[PDB]
């Protein structure tokens, strides 16, 4: 008779190692207080 390799049970001598790449990441600008908020926190503005 005749067989394909898919017709034979396959065992592996290979040791698995699943390494995945660290993904791209985007850092958006972030501020707790903008400089306009810091300017506006004063009660009276001398210039205005």
């Amino acid at each position, epitope marked *: *008779h*005749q067989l*394909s390799r898919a017709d034979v049970t396959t065992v592996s001598t290979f040791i698995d190692l699943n390494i995945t790449m660290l993904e791209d990441h985007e850092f958006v600008p972030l501020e707790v207080y903008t400089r306009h908020e810091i300017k506006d926190s004063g009660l009276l503005d001398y210039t205005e």
Partner: nanobody
Amino acid sequence: EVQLLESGGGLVQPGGSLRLSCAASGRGFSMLNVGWFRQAPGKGREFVATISWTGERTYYGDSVKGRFTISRDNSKNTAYLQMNSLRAEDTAVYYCAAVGPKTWDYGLASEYDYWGQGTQVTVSS
């Protein structure tokens, strides 16, 4: 072992087209030369076309050229015979045959091991 079935046969008309499907059940289809053999009514069986076990050669009968084209789909374990411009002298009963990688006599019939039930095709005006 491999058991073969045929589908797609039927009554056709001159100048038409058809595709026969030969489905194989079992193991080792990719290690099989697969061909067709047609027996005319009141006449012996004759070679038609055979694709090799690796699928890289396609042997054809001497009496037909370009009309019939055999191809293989290992994913479906099938052989497709595309038949074009049929003729009255061509019509017969078609059988699917398979043989291991153990002979180059694809034209000769008794070399093949796996023989199927066959299908009926007839052309008329």
